[PDB]
């Protein structure tokens, strides 16, 4: 759907994910470091 799809407070710049809790993103952020 494209109407009122509440999006998510932390979405990562560089990729399309995004989580509801920060301590998550926070681990996968990592992951841009290594063949990235
Ligand atoms: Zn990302």
């Known amino acids: ?3 009122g799809s ?3 407070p932390f979405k ?3 990729c399309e994910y ?3 809790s920060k ?3 926070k681990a996968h952020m ?3 470091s ?3």
């Open 12 to 14: 990562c710049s560089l």
């Open 30 to 32: 990592n992951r841009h």
């Open 18 to 20: 995004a989580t509801r």
């Open 23 to 25: 301590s998550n993103l």
């Open 1 to 3: 759907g494209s109407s």
């Open 6 to 8: 509440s999006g998510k």
């Open 34 to 36: 290594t063949e990235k």
